[PDB]
């Protein structure tokens, strides 16, 4: 009677249009997969250690478990260490905070031993301060500079507080409209795409979107912002702005120098290069400033995994486990012994080696899986899960014990608190350090002890 009478069935999930990066490519670097025991060491003269107000806890020379961040109930998953303060989010996406709050970098109220109990003890930032949390979103990365904090959300929104500091006094927080931001604040969108990664410095912070564009925000006296700022239009242009850096997969920043990894596996750096920390030129008397991004000459088989840098040194961690360092030698930041100094080390007018201005692979060291760098000290965990710190040690930031001499070579951190632990995340500040990890099973610690101390 009545008569009854192409489109794809399968479909791979790939990148869409101009998108180079996805947030999932980054959160494995920052957010731990399981709650961590938090360990702090160094000097907490400015409440950095987060171990309480008692003066006994102001100076800790070996990694000490932080009871204010218990693994069972606080459940700290990630943490970002600034210069005098740190942030940390838990398993329910609540950011913690402890450190110096002279410029509101802690995002919480402080008013009403020697240390301030509110500053020297970690506590949560009010959840109501983050509207995205109430809208069903999570924090995928935290960042902390010297005087400014920042939180990246899973929807691409960015919240930040604190200030940036110029060399003279206080520069400002955002575009002449606000001097100091005490509470978490919504950074207005500055890109058609969502931000995927943060890279904090001393008084600046970088951004990176899915498109691959890099943005800069903060102080730019040392050309950290990838451009130049005149005195007149300084506050008017103080906001996350690009600078001709496109097609970038990964960003990382020292205190006044930055790095960016492009899609074609090309690593460029810019900013301040006082001690060759950018690793771009062999002559250190030549350029104190790298205005235009300059490519680093790493070996061919190298695939960059992470990049950590401090004030005058940089550490490039490869996927094969090798660690490449470049920068200042005056406090053994690069971790290269005096007998293994390469040909291109810089001797000053007095004849003393001052820096290594090119990326140099460390030798006689274990394979590393992560690395962090403070102002003049560094921490890198090996493949088994043991930390190796080196550099400036007069503040016990290397956590190697009661001695004040600098350490020339990455040496093992060994104390009862950390020996049975596999540490996952490590951060470093000005004169302290923070590590987080999980305790191994009694048999997993049995084998590793047989591997090392035999």
């Amino acid at each position: 009677v009545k008569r009854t009478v192409h489109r794809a069935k399968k479909m791979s999930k790939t990148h869409a249009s101009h998108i180079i990066n996805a947030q999932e490519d980054y959160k494995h670097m920052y957010l731990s997969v399981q709650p961590l025991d938090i360990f702090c060491w160094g000097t907490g003269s400015m409440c950095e250690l987060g171990l309480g107000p008692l003066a006994k806890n102001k100076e800790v020379k070996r990694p000490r478990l932080n009871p204010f961040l218990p693994r069972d109930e606080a459940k700290i998953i990630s943490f970002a260490v600034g210069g005098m303060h740190t942030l940390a989010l838990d398993e329910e996406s609540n950011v913690w905070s402890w450190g110096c709050n002279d410029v509101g970098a802690l995002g919480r109220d402080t008013s009403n031993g020697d240390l301030n109990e509110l500053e020297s003890t970690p506590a949560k930032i009010p959840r109501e301060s983050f509207p995205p949390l109430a809208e069903g979103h999570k924090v995928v990365q935290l960042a902390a500079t010297d005087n400014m904090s920042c939180a990246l959300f899973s929807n691409g929104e960015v919240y930040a507080w604190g200030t940036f500091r110029c060399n003279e006094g206080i520069l400002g927080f955002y575009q002449d409209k606000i001097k100091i931001q005490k509470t978490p604040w919504k950074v207005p969108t500055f890109s058609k795409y969502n931000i995927v990664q943060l890279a904090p410095g001393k008084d600046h912070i970088l951004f990176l979107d899915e498109e691959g564009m890099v943005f800069a925000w903060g102080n730019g006296q040392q050309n950290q912002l990838g451009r130049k700022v005149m005195e007149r239009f300084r506050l008017k242009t103080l906001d996350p702005r690009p600078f001709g850096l496109r097609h970038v997969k990964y960003i990382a920043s020292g205190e006044n120098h930055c790095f960016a990894l492009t899609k074609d596996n090309k690593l460029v750096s810019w900013g301040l290069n006082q001690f060759g920390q950018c690793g771009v030129s062999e002559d250190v008397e030549d350029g104190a400033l790298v205005t235009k991004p300059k490519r680093l000459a790493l070996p061919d088989n190298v695939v960059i995994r992470s990049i950590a840098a401090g004030e005058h040194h940089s550490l490039i961690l490869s996927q094969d486990g090798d660690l490449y360092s470049c920068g200042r030698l005056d406090m053994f930041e690069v971790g290269i012994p005096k007998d293994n100094l390469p040909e291109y080390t810089y001797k000053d007018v007095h004849g003393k080696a001052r820096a290594v201005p090119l990326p140099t692979k460390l030798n006689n060291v274990p394979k590393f899986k992560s690395v962090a760098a403070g102002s003049h000290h560094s921490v890198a965990v090996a493949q088994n899960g043991i930390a190796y710190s080196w550099g400036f040690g007069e503040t016990y930031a290397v956590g190697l014990g009661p001695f004040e001499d600098d350490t020339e070579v990455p040496t093992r951190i060994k104390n009862t608190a950390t020996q049975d632990h596999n540490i996952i995340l490590v951060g470093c500040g000005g004169q302290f350090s923070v590590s987080g990890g999980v305790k191994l099973s009694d048999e997993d610690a049995e084998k590793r002890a047989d591997e090392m101390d035999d």
Binding site: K2, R3, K13, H15, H28, G136
Partner: protein
């Protein structure tokens, strides 16, 4: 890199598991030639499905289901690896436990599985995937409902062994809302899923029409591009395959002024499937023919019956031939048809068409002649003039030359109507 990635994937450090699972997902997410067999050969598939267990952390489940998604997107043999790892139930479990991210991730993998063949489509339905999938349509992100609608399109799909009407008919109330979306990519998948379901016995055609759907299907007959006009036209096309109380409802939503808009569409398949729809609505009540009469649909159809191609003239003939069938109750349907210039395109169709169209064209020319037989008896005439202009267009010669074809039914009719009127 693979020997390193495989070794890092099997390490007991869960964080190293996550970093390795990200690397596998990245190389499996390349746009061209993803190394699916090379990672299948690597023996890491049974561990990827291990990372989707209930106890596993969410970041690990996300990267694992994403990597397995792109493995299932390949050859029908490469999808067999994912299903023989017993991964489909874990995909459905993550539709309950995990967050929005993993739910969008697993609904993508289930879509590639359910779209490979009909046995995998039933297998997905076999594991009670319908209830969690339909529950995903209360979320907010337009991409989640985009991937979920596409998977739901592959579920209503397949006709050689049709999907279980019981487990699939639960989705129409959810599809009735998805047509009202504005995302162009979602509603296209939503319309195709409806056209797949509107095809079947009356248990389905009555079900589609009982859930408020066909009113907007005519509203989406008018859309910008043709990517949505085609599934919606197929949807309203399968609805008229039912009884005449079912076709009567589509007529209410102004379907006929919308069908004329499609009769001049740039895409030819929109022209043809419009004529196929106009064909079946002209096969109901004699008043349903009048609906097509007054709707000004026949002037463009008779010109299609002349200049358009055979794939479209055939369905245009069925529309015109079924229209003349209403002359028993109301002989003026032919009276309206003869004035539009219908006898010449029908007669010129005699030599170019085939056994199945010469049949219906003769039925049209006969019911035209049968009306004129009643015109020369009730009205005073002594010659039937419905045959006067058949040969004015050269049709009496062609129908006389239709007695030579050896098909039984066309020789029995061409010879009968030529003796009855000539």
């Amino acid at each position: 890199e693979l020997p390193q990635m495989t070794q890092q994937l099997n390490s007991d450090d869960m964080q190293e598991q996550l970093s390795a699972t990200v690397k596998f997902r990245q190389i499996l997410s390349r746009e061209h030639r993803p190394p699916i067999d090379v990672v299948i050969q690597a023996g890491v598939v049974p561990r990827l499905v291990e990372f989707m267990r209930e106890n596993q952390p969410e970041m690990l489940q996300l990267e694992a289901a994403w990597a397995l998604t792109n493995i299932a997107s390949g050859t029908s043999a490469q999808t067999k690896v994912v299903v023989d790892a017993d991964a489909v139930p874990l995909f459905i479990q993550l539709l309950y436990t995990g967050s929005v991210e993993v739910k969008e991730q697993a609904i993508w993998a289930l879509g590639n599985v359910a779209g490979d063949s009909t046995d995998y489509r039933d297998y997905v339905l076999q594991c009670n995937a319908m209830e969690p999938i339909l529950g995903l349509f209360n979320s907010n992100k337009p991409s989640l409902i985009r991937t979920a609608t596409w998977t739901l399109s592959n579920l209503c799909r397949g006709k050689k062994p049709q999907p279980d009407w019981s487990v699939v008919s639960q989705a129409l109330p959810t599809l009735a809302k998805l047509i009202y979306s504005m995302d162009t990519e979602t509603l296209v998948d939503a319309c195709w899923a409806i056209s797949y379901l509107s095809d079947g016995p009356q248990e389905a055609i009555q079900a589609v029409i009982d859930v408020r759907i066909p009113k907007r299907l005519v509203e989406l007959l008018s859309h910008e591009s043709t990517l949505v006009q085609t599934p919606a036209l197929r949807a309203v096309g399968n609805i008229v395959t039912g009884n005449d109380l079912q076709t009567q409802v589509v007529i209410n939503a102004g379907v006929l002024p919308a069908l004329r808009l499609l009769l001049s569409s740039p895409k030819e398949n929109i022209k043809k499937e419009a004529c196929w729809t106009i064909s079946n609505i002209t096969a109901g009540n004699t008043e349903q023919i009048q609906a097509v009469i007054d709707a000004n649909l026949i002037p463009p159809l008779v010109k299609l019956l002349e200049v358009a191609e055979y794939k479209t003239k055939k369905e245009a003939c069925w529309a015109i031939s079924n229209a003349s069938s209403g002359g028993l109750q109301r002989p003026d349907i032919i009276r309206y048809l003869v004035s539009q210039g219908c006898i010449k395109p029908l007669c010129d169709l005699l030599e170019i068409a085939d056994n199945r169209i010469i049949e219906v064209t003769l039925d049209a020319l006969e019911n035209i002649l049968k009306m004129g037989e009643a015109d020369k008896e009730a009205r005073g005439l002594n010659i039937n003039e419905n045959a006067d202009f058949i040969e004015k267009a050269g049709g009496m010669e062609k129908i006389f030359n239709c007695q030579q074809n050896e098909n039984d039914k066309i020789y029995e009719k061409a010879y009968k109507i030529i003796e009855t009127y000539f």
